[PDB]
Design a protein around this nucleic acid. Structure first.
Ligand SMILES: [Mg+2]
Ligand SMILES: [Mg+2]
Ligand SMILES: [Mg+2]
Ligand SMILES: [Mg+2]
Ligand SMILES: [Mg+2]
Ligand SMILES: [Mg+2]
Ligand SMILES: [Mg+2]
Ligand SMILES: [Mg+2]
Ligand SMILES: [Mg+2]
Ligand SMILES: [Mg+2]
Ligand SMILES: [Mg+2]
Ligand SMILES: [Mg+2]
Ligand SMILES: [Mg+2]
Ligand SMILES: [Mg+2]
Ligand SMILES: [Mg+2]
Ligand SMILES: [Mg+2]
Ligand SMILES: [Mg+2]
Ligand SMILES: [Mg+2]
Ligand SMILES: [Mg+2]
Ligand SMILES: [Mg+2]
Ligand SMILES: [Mg+2]
Ligand SMILES: [Mg+2]
Ligand SMILES: [Mg+2]
Ligand SMILES: [Mg+2]
Ligand SMILES: [Mg+2]
Ligand SMILES: [Mg+2]
Ligand SMILES: [Mg+2]
Ligand SMILES: [Mg+2]
Ligand SMILES: [Mg+2]
Ligand SMILES: [Mg+2]
Ligand SMILES: [Mg+2]
Ligand SMILES: [Mg+2]
Ligand SMILES: [Mg+2]
Ligand SMILES: [Mg+2]
Ligand SMILES: [Mg+2]
Ligand SMILES: [Mg+2]
Ligand SMILES: [Mg+2]
Ligand SMILES: [Mg+2]
Ligand SMILES: [Mg+2]
Ligand SMILES: [Mg+2]
Lengths: 51, 64, 76, 96
RNA sequence: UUUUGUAUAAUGGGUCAGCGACUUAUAUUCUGUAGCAAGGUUAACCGAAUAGGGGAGCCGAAGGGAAACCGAGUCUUAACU
RNA sequence: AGGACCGAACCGACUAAUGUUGAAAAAUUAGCGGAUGACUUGUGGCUGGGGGUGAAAGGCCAAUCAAACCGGGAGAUAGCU
RNA sequence: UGUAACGGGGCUAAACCAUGCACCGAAGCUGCGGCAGCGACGCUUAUGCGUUGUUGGGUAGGGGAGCGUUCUGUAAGCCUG
RNA sequence: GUUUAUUAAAAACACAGCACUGUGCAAACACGAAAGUGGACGUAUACGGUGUGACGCCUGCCCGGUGCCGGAAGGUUAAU
RNA sequence: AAUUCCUUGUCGGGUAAGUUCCGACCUGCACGAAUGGCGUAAUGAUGGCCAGGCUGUCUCCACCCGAGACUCAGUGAAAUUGAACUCGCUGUGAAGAUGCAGUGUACCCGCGGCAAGACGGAAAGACCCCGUGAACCUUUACUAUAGCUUGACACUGAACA
RNA sequence: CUUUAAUGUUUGAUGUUCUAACGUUGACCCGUAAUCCGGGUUGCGGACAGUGUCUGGUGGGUAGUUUGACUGGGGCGGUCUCCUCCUAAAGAGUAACGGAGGAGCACGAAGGUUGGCUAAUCCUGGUCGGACAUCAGGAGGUUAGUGCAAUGGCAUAAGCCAGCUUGACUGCGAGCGUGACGGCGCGAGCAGGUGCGAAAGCAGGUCAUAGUGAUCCGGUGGUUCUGAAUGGAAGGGCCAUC
């Protein structure tokens, strides 16, 4: 409900992604969060993208 | 004539060693972002058909 | 405007009573708030379910200055 | 399968899998089968003649089933760790 | 007969005689029973024809896995307490 | 002269009674309208079933027409009795 | 519609309270005899029989055991002018 | 005049009369996979459709919606 | 008002008395101009109203004449029907009883008559509901389609600008 | 080459003509003592019209079907999923077109952790200031507060700040709860990697309970799977996801 689904993508080469939502209006910039990439088995920066 | 297999059943159940049937869990097809990772984790593995349902499945897979 | 609605009963309540012997993990109470609080060898989950952290016998007690209800588990 | 109108179990739940065309031309051989071939040499050909595997079979694995009481030779067949020991305990030879 | 319930003023039958309704085929499972038994059994056909021949097949003695595959283990998982 | 008047034959069918297991699956009796006209009647022909024909009522199409009749699909289907 | 607001007759208790002891009263209990199911045990086990507890209202329905009809074999047998 | 043969004969249908409107003839329109045919051996003072219903006095306002007639510039637009 | 709900509107006429009829009013619940308005002589087995005559339509029925009905002879059906030794009352009761209870009454059988009951006969209710029944019918419901219409190619060529 | 004309040239567009396809329901001859048909001639039209295949529109003209259930008959009205309280008879559960209400979201902080804090309301005093703003004292004691409905909770705060952060982790999971099933839920603990803290320790979202949609078909990314002679590829499976 106005809250859009986005995917956070692994900054390593893997194509691993977490999925979440965003109020794309009030918080229009790209969400960037450290999370665990299970393919390299290490925590890596993840950066917002479209779904 | 030969009984005809209910084919969508046969595309959803497989018979196991002691005579049961294995099947894939419901609820892991789409609308995923909202579902807890735990719930989806526990739906990945296959499961056994419950007792109440064996009559139905067996009726549908006479050649299993 | 107009009535006619209700929700499913959540089947809450005490699941193992005083003395019942349980293996760890067994839910002892389903509750909304902490009517019973978790005591020794008892855990409290996110919906305030109290559960066993050890094999033993369920033990209800009342402790402390607020006379709160506590559940613990005695080794048997 | 009809359940009164409710979305039935064979629809309720999702489909899975694919069928391997290779599994169907791939067969398993028991140790109890090794003596049943006229000649003490086990190939696909040996086994087909003794009517132990089907004609259209292209691959086979000897499994640890039954026992083996005769030195036997196997060839072009996969052998499980156990089966290899049982054949060899009885003097057999496993050649590719 | 149907029914919560029918002396019911609820249904059917004026009476007799004869006819009148869970069958059959092929599959499939379970029980009983008979054979044989880690085996069991043949189909079409052949035929000296209910014999005998015929073992193409089918079921079973091995499972796990979506599959490759592995195998008394396999899958899961980088790995499993 | 008149889809003119009165009135039999002819054609029709407004009332009433009778009849209603009838004399009759639509009539009888007394009365009633038209009666040279968009009249009436004989023989024979044509129009065929989602089709005909209809001064139109869903009327008529061989005593049952909001889709004729016979045979067929045919043991339609019947969670009803 | 007719006594019709004890079922009736009738009753001053044959009504009401209270006490008491009698008796009637059922397919309930007991008695005599009998059958079956299920047990057990036995005189003695070829599974029957024998003793002996106990059970035996029943719809939908499940289970068991049977009678009897027509037809094949037994049967060129057996009964039958 | 007509009508529901057989529960409705009327205020229903028809009707002359009126209007709208289509039709230039190989007409429109109808029956027909077609050929063929009615229309008509007719030709806009004719033919079809539709609504009104002798006659007398009359028939006002609305084109926004629906329908039809007309339009060619743009926008949108099929096979290709 | 073939239209007016309220409504027997109101007023006037007729009548001894008129929810209708005639005439008016306008407050048209909800007339209105060819899905025609208003009128109209004549016409009509057409609707409403009124009056002369008329009479058994009625007060209120009498008598008579014929055909039946009844008796005798001949022929000789029908619907229906579980079986009947087939009464009344009050009550009971699948809730409206010849059949149960209690009571009252009643000697056996016909014949002519009536229709209160047998929830009398007759047709597996037409109203009402249900069925994931049926059929026609309507439409700016859905999907298709004849038709009508649009254009691309094909049958379909040449020449000059 | 810079430009520019015109002849001469390819295919379109647009015309204007022609005739030889096609039309002729004009006239004529013949088959023929024939208002058919055919062939001939002739005029009239002419690449049009018309027909075939393809295609847009139109199409109740025709056709096949759909058009819900609950319901103190039906219709109208209302209602259909989910959460909370009551009815509910002190475990669970429990009906009604019973009685009240509320959801179909929100938050990258309003999540994690460490450190810290404690409301509401009244009296008295106080510039503008008021019945009520901000300041102070006292009383009070959670009557506050919780992103929101109700109930249950909450000071050890779950209520209010701040710093550092991404555990709103990936793989699993003893053992439980609740369900006809599909499913839903709670869960210590294990592995890997992580945040906060000196540390013991906490963290697998939010005080909990609503905030939702099975299957199929199909999109996107990944992939030691599969790859119809063979190597590839397409399609398929597998993980994620829409
Ligand atoms: Mg998926
Ligand atoms: Mg449904
Ligand atoms: Mg073989
Ligand atoms: Mg009843
Ligand atoms: Mg019953
Ligand atoms: Mg009866
Ligand atoms: Mg009867
Ligand atoms: Mg005349
Ligand atoms: Mg007459
Ligand atoms: Mg006359
Ligand atoms: Mg005739
Ligand atoms: Mg058929
Ligand atoms: Mg039938
Ligand atoms: Mg008395
Ligand atoms: Mg006494
Ligand atoms: Mg006795
Ligand atoms: Mg007894
Ligand atoms: Mg008639
Ligand atoms: Mg009549
Ligand atoms: Mg008219
Ligand atoms: Mg006008
Ligand atoms: Mg236009
Ligand atoms: Mg008047
Ligand atoms: Mg007349
Ligand atoms: Mg006589
Ligand atoms: Mg009776
Ligand atoms: Mg009757
Ligand atoms: Mg009926
Ligand atoms: Mg009926
Ligand atoms: Mg063209
Ligand atoms: Mg239709
Ligand atoms: Mg309903
Ligand atoms: Mg409770
Ligand atoms: Mg209780
Ligand atoms: Mg703290
Ligand atoms: Mg103050
Ligand atoms: Mg540290
Ligand atoms: Mg919070
Ligand atoms: Mg290929
Ligand atoms: Mg290949």
């Amino acid at each position: 409900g106005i809250r859009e689904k986005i995917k956070l993508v692994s900054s390593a080469g893997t194509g691993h992604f977490y999925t979440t939502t965003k109020n794309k209006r009030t918080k229009p910039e790209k969400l960037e969060l450290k999370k665990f990439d299970p393919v390299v088995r290490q925590h890596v920066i993840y950066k917002e993208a479209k779904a | 004539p030969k009984i005809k297999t209910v084919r969508g059943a046969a595309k959803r159940f497989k018979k196991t060693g002691k005579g049961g049937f294995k099947h894939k869990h419901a609820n892991l097809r789409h609308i995923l972002t909202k579902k807890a990772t735990k719930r989806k984790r526990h739906l990945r593995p296959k499961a056994m058909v419950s007792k109440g349902d064996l009559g139905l499945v067996i009726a549908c897979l006479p050649y299993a | 405007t107009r009535n006619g609605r209700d929700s499913e009963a959540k089947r809450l309540g005490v699941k193992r009573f005083g003395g019942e012997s349980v293996l760890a993990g067994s839910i002892i109470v389903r509750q909304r708030g902490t009517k019973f609080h978790a005591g020794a060898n008892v855990g409290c989950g996110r919906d305030h379910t109290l559960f066993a952290k050890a094999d033993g016998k369920v033990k209800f007690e009342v402790k402390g200055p607020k006379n709160r209800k506590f559940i613990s588990i005695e080794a048997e | 399968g009809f359940e009164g109108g409710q979305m039935p179990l064979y629809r309720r739940l999702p489909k899975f899998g694919f069928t391997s065309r290779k599994a169907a031309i791939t067969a398993e051989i028991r140790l109890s089968d090794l003596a049943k071939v006229e000649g003490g040499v086990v190939d696909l050909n040996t086994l087909k003649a003794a009517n132990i595997i089907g004609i259209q079979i292209e691959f086979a694995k000897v499994i640890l089933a039954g026992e083996v009481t005769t030195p036997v030779t196997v060839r072009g067949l996969r052998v499980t760790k156990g089966a290899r020991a049982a054949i060899e305990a009885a003097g057999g030879k496993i050649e590719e």
